[PDB]
Design a protein around this ligand. Structure first.
Ligand code: PCW
Ligand code: PCW
Ligand code: BEF
Ligand code: MG
Length: 883
């Protein structure tokens, strides 16, 4: 933090310390100022905040009224569903608290400090600003500080930039302001030293470090409300107000009837009927099993994602994946596989589009290029498949193995007879080999230092290079590779005296050049198709990487996010933009490059500020704040534990196409939830229509609270779940993300609910009337029969809004068939001689009256299918039915 622009001396005078260390008294004094070098809503009376839900208020009042009326067991049943669904909400809030853990067991446990004039190892938590720390290879950087002594020091800063490659450190003052990854004279707590010796003065400990800033970012990330959760809140308020209006109307009708009517009835009988009708409508309108059924449908979605090795922690998260509009992705490790890979090559004697795959189909230039790439390196791959060596060198033996040439056969056939190690100030490596009684020296390295030592080229024979069209073409192709962000290596050999047994450093001149290679961190194979798949779904994909701008533009230009000559925003350029300017430039970036961990969480917050449900995919500590802040965080299975604990879905097999698949799965989840809710309320609406009609005509209440509770809880639970198991619709994933403000009955579902409900109600009204011709008790049995059987049979009509049961496949959904058969068993249980008076079914209720009621239910469901088929064959633009 602006320390890297100062010299070591200025930083020393700022911390009031020298390079010979601190004394014990000064260290104790600074420990009181700074503290030790370490990091550091939920409450179970929230069970009371579950009682702010209107449906809960309605059911609590209905339960108390029934308590007063003497209906105790149905009051107890209501209290059971209340207690249960409340704990269904508490289990959704409690687990999110262990996501607020910030488990940093990756901090360094030891510090190698100079104190009192003596080098000693201390607990790293005891470090303080001004301490002089020594770094050696394999040590973990214990605190942030400014280097003042470096001996070829190289550190892995993959926790801040996402790149596991070691960066070289230098003690020089950085004159200009550069991004966080390019702070060459700064070391950061949490990183791992790879090579060299170092010595730095601590400038930051505890939460005043870059990793401490990451911990603070994780802390501030607060959970969002789910789109389904918002839709259900708004609908619950509407249902509560409506029910309150119906109850006021019930008391109004009862009071006007006793006031402006026949004196026969009592005030007591009228007030009791008013209460019974109000409680009946209250229970009938509320789908008491809704949150439970929704949980089961969500579970089916998360299991379908689990078969693809995508483990979703929270159940509602799968539905949120369906409403995704922006997918922010990290590059290294996420879009790619963090695997250096040969992608292009150049041979002067003919370059092909792709390198051939038969080792015997190759040209002599191709076989010599492969032999030099394999024999001039020390990397290896064992039988298990573990890679050992520099990833640049493992890229070459992986290239040979990819093209059906086992690198081991070449290492076994040509043995190493002498080597020159790779020098830093002489980026070059040579090995000595005997090729069919001819000794040769193989040599490889970067084109800049290799062209200066090449005096021959391998075209047809061994030929001297002319500057025009040979060296100029080589430099043309090298800089063309650099424009595409490719690491280039030049290869060559030298025929050697047959008496040589060792290589000398004076023998690395007049080399015969063979060819060139170009390697990059390539995207995953499924990335191209997934990005196109998400574009068809109305999903914007943004790339947020800590890698360099050139690499981040080359990729992204390759995966279909950037056209040629499109620029990527940098963390340096981003930190200088205020939020208002970023709000106006946010929708026109596609790639951010070389960003800090705070930049990612800032972009994700900005996209959420646009109102978009955002997903963030990542694999490292630099993504963790953005993974926790995002609406849905997806971590790579091969990523760090910090990002996995911060994410909501984890791709165990690193299968990138799972993300888009999750969106597709999520979309069908919500579609099926909509189906189930529409199925549930269509039944409730039919019940309300039957009760209110019985009210305005002064009939007996067609239903009992115990009957309504039994239908809404036991009979209608399996059919709603079965509707939850419905196949994905054909044109899903061709659709745009749903609006968050969209209602839960939007898009023809409201029309479907009212049509099916009115039909069920008319069926119950006619059924109750027919039963009313015998006795009031017979009318209750027939109204209950028609209601429960029309709700059972409606499942066929509720499977789809645009397709009859016979059309989709009458047996295409086997869970619906089993559900209807099981509900028939339920209705049969209600008429068993023991449970008849329980369900208010008189002894005289026979197969004749049952036949009439069941026929009415079946006729109503046939009318639902007829109305649907007329609506979708003749009014198919905006589906609306008539007849
Ligand atoms: C094995 C593979 C199939 C699995 C699925 C189904 C399995 C479930 C079957 C049974 C479960 C146990 C229920 C059995 C006991 C009930 C039968 C019964 O005890 O019956 C006798 C009574 C009355 O007998 P009664 O009138 O002679 O005496 C009248 C004289 N008095 C007035 C003096 C009484 O009857 C009544 O209570 C009327 C009760 C009728 C029960 C029918 C239940 C079927 C449910 C749905 C059918 C689908 C409807 C489709 C539309 C049909 C259009 C017509
Ligand atoms: C079914 C019929 C229902 C009708 C009955 C009506 C009464 C029901 C009332 C309470 C039921 C008690 C069961 C609570 C579940 C355990 C809570 C839990 O386990 O959470 C606690 C979580 O702590 C917290 O974070 C703070 C929240 C504390 C919860 C306090 C709950 C206390 C309940 C008080 C009821 C007050 C009524 C007093 C009446 C006295 C009249 C005689 C347990 O933390 P811990 O320290 O024990 O160990 C933790 C070890 N770790 C974290 C590794 C798992
Ligand atoms: F690993 Be990411 F590209 F920062
Ligand atoms: Mg990464």
């Amino acid at each position: 933090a602006e320390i890297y622009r100062k010299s070591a001396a200025e930083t020393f005078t700022q911390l009031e310390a020298t390079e010979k260390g601190l004394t014990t008294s000064e260290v104790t004094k600074r420990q009181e100022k700074y503290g030790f070098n370490e990091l550091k809503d939920p409450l179970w009376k929230l069970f009371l905040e579950t009682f702010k839900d209107p449906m809960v208020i309605v059911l609590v009042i209905a339960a108390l009224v029934q308590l007063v009326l003497g209906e105790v067991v149905e009051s107890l049943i209501i209290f059971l569903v209340l207690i249960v669904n409340s704990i269904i909400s508490v289990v959704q809030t409690r687990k999110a608290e262990s996501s607020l853990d910030a488990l940093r067991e990756m901090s360094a446990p030891v510090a190698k400090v100079i104190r009192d004039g003596s080098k000693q190892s201390i607990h790293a938590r005891e470090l303080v600003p001004g301490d002089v720390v020594i770094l050696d290879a394999g040590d973990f950087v214990p605190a942030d500080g400014r280097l003042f002594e470096s001996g070829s020091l190289k550190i892995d800063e993959g926790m801040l930039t996402g790149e596991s490659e070691a960066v070289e450190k230098y003690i020089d003052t950085i004159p200009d302001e550069v991004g966080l990854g390019d702070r060459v004279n700064m070391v950061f707590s949490g990183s791992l030293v790879v090579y060299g010796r170092g010595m730095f003065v601590v400038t930051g400990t505890a939460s005043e470090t870059e990793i401490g800033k990451i911990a603070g970012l994780l802390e501030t990330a607060e959970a969002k409300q789910t789109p389904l959760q918002r839709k259900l809140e708004s609908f619950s308020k509407k249902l509560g107000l409506g029910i309150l209006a119906l109850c006021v109307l019930i008391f109004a009708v009862e009071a006007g009837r006793v006031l402006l009517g026949d004196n026969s009835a009592d005030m007591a009988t009228a007030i009791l009927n008013a209460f019974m009708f109000a409680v009946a409508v209250a229970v009938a309108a509320i789908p008491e099993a809704l949150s439970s059924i929704v949980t089961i449908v969500l579970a089916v979605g998360t299991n379908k994602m689990a078969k693809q090795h995508a483990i979703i922690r929270k159940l509602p998260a799968v539905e949120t994946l369906g409403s995704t509009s922006v997918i922010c992705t990290d590059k290294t490790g996420t879009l790619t596989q963090n695997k250096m890979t040969v992608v292009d090559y150049y041979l002067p004697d003919g370059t092909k589009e792709n390198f051939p795959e038969s080792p015997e189909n190759w040209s002599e230039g191709e076989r010599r290029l492969i032999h030099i790439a394999v024999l001039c390196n020390d990397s290896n791959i064992n039988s298990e498949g573990k890679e050992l060596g520099d990833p640049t060198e493992v890229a070459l033996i992986a290239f040979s193995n990819k093209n059906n040439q086992d690198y081991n056969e070449i290492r076994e056939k040509f043995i190493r007879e002498g080597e020159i190690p790779f020098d830093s100030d002489r980026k070059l490596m040579s090995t000595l080999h005997t090729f069919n009684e001819n000794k040769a020296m193989l040599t490889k390295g970067g084109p800049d230092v290799m062209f200066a030592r090449c005096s021959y080229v391998f075209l047809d024979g061994e030929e001297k290079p002319m500057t025009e069209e040979i060296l100029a073409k080589l430099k043309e192709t090298n800089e063309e590779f650099s424009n595409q962000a490719l690491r280039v290596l030049a290869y060559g050999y030298k025929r050697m005296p047959a008496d040589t047994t060792e290589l000398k450093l004076e023998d690395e001149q007049d080399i015969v050049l063979v060819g060139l290679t170009a390697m990059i961190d390539p995207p995953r194979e499924a990335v191209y198709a997934s990005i196109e798949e998400s574009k068809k779904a109305g999903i914007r994909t943004v790339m947020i990487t800590g890698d360099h701008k050139t690499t981040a533009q080359a990729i992204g230009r390759d995966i279909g996010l950037m056209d040629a000559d499109d620029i990527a925003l940098t963390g340096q350029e981003l930190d200088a933009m205020p939020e208002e300017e970023l709000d106006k430039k946010l929708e026109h970036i596609a790639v951010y490059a070389r960003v800090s961990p705070e930049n990612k969480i800032r972009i994700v917050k900005a996209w959420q500020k646009k109102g978009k449900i955002t997903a963030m995919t990542g694999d490292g500590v630099n993504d963790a704040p953005a993974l926790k802040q995002a609406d849905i965080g997806v971590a790579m299975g091969s990523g760090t534990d910090v990002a996995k604990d911060s994410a909501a879905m984890i791709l165990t097999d690193d299968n990138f196409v799972s993300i888009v698949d999750a969106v597709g799965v999520g979309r069908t989840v919500f579609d099926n939830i909509k189906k189930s809710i529409a199925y549930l309320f269509a039944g409730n609406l039919g019940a309300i229509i039957a009760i209110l009609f019985a009210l305005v005509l002064d009939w007996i209440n067609p239903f009992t609270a115990l009957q309504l509770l039994f239908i809404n809880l036991v009979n209608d639970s399996l059919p709603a779940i079965a509707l939850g198991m419905e196949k994905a619709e054909p044109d899903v994933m061709k659709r745009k993300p749903r609006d968050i403000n969209e209602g839960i009955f939007a898009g023809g579902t409201m029309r479907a609910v009212i049509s099916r409900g009115v039909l069920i109600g008319i069926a119950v009204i006619i059924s109750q009337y027919i039963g009313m011709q015998i006795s009031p008790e017979m009318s209750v049995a027939m109204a209950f029969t028609t209601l429960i059987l029309a709700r059972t049979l409606q499942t066929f009509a509720a499977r789809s809004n645009v397709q009859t049961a016979f059309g989709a496949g009458f047996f295409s959904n086997k869970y619906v068939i089993g559900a209807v058969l099981l509900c028939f068993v339920l209705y049969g249980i209600t008429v068993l001689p023991g449970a008849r008076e329980i369900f208010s079914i008189p002894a005289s209720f026979g197969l004749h009256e049952w036949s009439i009621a069941a026929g009415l239910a079946l006729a109503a469901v046939v009318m639902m299918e007829i109305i649907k088929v007329v609506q979708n064959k003749f009014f198919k633009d905006y589906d609306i039915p008539t007849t």
